[PDB]
């Protein structure tokens, strides 16, 4: 008797009637197969004499059969969503992330525990009908599949991966030609005692990265340390498993973690003994958390409650209407209730402020932007 589907359908109806007053853009597209990953590509082309620009998204497939693909889709944003490239992928794409120093390079996480590296300019637009997956690099060192995947934005070719085997693998492919070879992990970090759900390099200091795991711990690691079994700092972050973390791109000391305790925790690297803030509103386990690329105080989180919350830490502690207090805390800026299933991933558009692409379990891809009067 799990008619949460009844609650879902009715909420969706009320949301669909209220799209015009809460959104400046709503694009909905059903994919052939659901995507577990979503990330805007940094390039954008604006044709002359036209009202739309072309943005690209790195997607993947999650199929039950043996025809998985790494997908690149194009999006026409004002001021149509179509697939552009489909590359044969061994198993479903757990996560796909492009290299910041070369967005042609895309790393993927596979169910076989291998991390695959693709140069999508070295593959045809139509996938190989034979069914063979030909990665430009095969990264080895993991025993189980995972979901944490992070390119170092200050050390080119340094890639981290978090897996269910309780380990974090680091690869240095900067000196390796991408000719289909197998590369073993340069370093394996074993500080966690449970499934490592996410990993992320620090966005400014090339030697630092964070990890979160099912042991409810956030760990801050330094590659300069010789001990790979113990991190620099281990933080009891949450009262349940921690599924995601994300560093602030404008505040070198701030990071956020999302957890199965339904909360998002704010952290300061200078004093990790005190959780800065606890963002509360989510009604179920949180899977993804991402800082806004344009505003240092704006942060978003998504998860199994089929919601995407957008937070504004500058509004923490604000006095609010009693009725307004019923809708949520003051730092809760916006609740995106467009998805009718669990949201797997989401990405902030780095060229169009406040535009977000979110993907859900029901094959639904949504490209949306909250109304200007809400944040402005």
């Amino acid at each position: 008797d799990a008619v949460e589907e009844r609650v879902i359908n009715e909420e969706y109806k009320i949301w669909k009637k209220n799209t015009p007053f809460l959104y400046d853009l709503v694009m909905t597209h059903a994919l052939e197969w659901p995507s577990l990953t979503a990330q805007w590509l940094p390039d954008v082309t604006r044709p002359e004499g036209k009202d739309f620009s072309i943005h690209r998204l790195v997607l993947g497939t999650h199929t039950s059969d043996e025809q998985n693909h790494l997908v690149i889709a194009s999006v026409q944003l004002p001021n149509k969503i179509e697939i552009e490239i489909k590359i044969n992928h061994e198993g479903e794409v757990n996560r796909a992330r492009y290299m910041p120093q070369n967005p042609c390079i895309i790393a993927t996480k596979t169910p076989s525990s291998d991390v695959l590296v693709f140069d999508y300019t070295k593959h045809p637009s139509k996938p190989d009908p034979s069914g063979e997956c030909n990665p430009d690099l095969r990264l080895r060192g993991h025993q189980k599949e995972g979901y944490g995947l992070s390119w170092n934005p200050n050390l080119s070719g340094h890639l981290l991966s978090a897996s269910d085997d309780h380990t974090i693998c680091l690869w240095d492919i900067s000196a390796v030609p991408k000719e289909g070879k197998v590369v073993d992990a340069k370093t394996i970090f074993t500080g966690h005692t449970a499934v490592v759900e996410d990993v992320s390099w620090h966005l400014l200091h090339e030697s630092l990265f964070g990890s979160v795991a099912d042991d409810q711990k956030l760990m801050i690691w330094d590659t300069r340390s010789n001990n790979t079994s113990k991190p620099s700092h281990s933080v009891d972050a949450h009262t349940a498993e921690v599924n995601c973390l994300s560093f602030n791109p404008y505040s070198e000391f701030i990071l956020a973690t999302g957890s199965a305790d339904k909360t998002v925790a704010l952290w300061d690297l200078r004093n990790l003994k005190l959780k800065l803030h606890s963002f509360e509103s989510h009604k179920d386990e949180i899977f993804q958390v991402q800082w806004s690329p344009h505003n240092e105080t704006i942060l978003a989180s998504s998860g199994t409650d089929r919601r995407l919350n957008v937070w504004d830490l500058s509004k923490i502690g604000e006095e609010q209407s009693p009725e307004d207090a019923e809708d949520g805390p003051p730092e809760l800026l916006f609740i995106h209730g467009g998805h009718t299933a669990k949201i797997s991933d989401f990405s902030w558009n780095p060229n169009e402020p406040w535009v977000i692409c979110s993907v859900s379990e029901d094959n639904i891809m949504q490209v949306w932007q909250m109304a200007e009067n809400i944040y402005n």
Binding site: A30, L36, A260, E361, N363
Partner: peptide, 12 residues
């Protein structure tokens, strides 16, 4: 905890 990915995804 919720599975990171569903057991059987469906084609559209």
């Amino acid at each position: 905890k919720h599975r990171r990915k569903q057991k059987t995804p469906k084609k559209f």
